[PDB]
Design a protein that fits this description.
Elements lengths: L8
Length: about 10
């Protein structure tokens, strides 16, 4: 899911 991802 987002946020939580390095390029989100």
């Amino acid at each position: 899911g987002c946020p939580x991802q390095p390029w989100c």
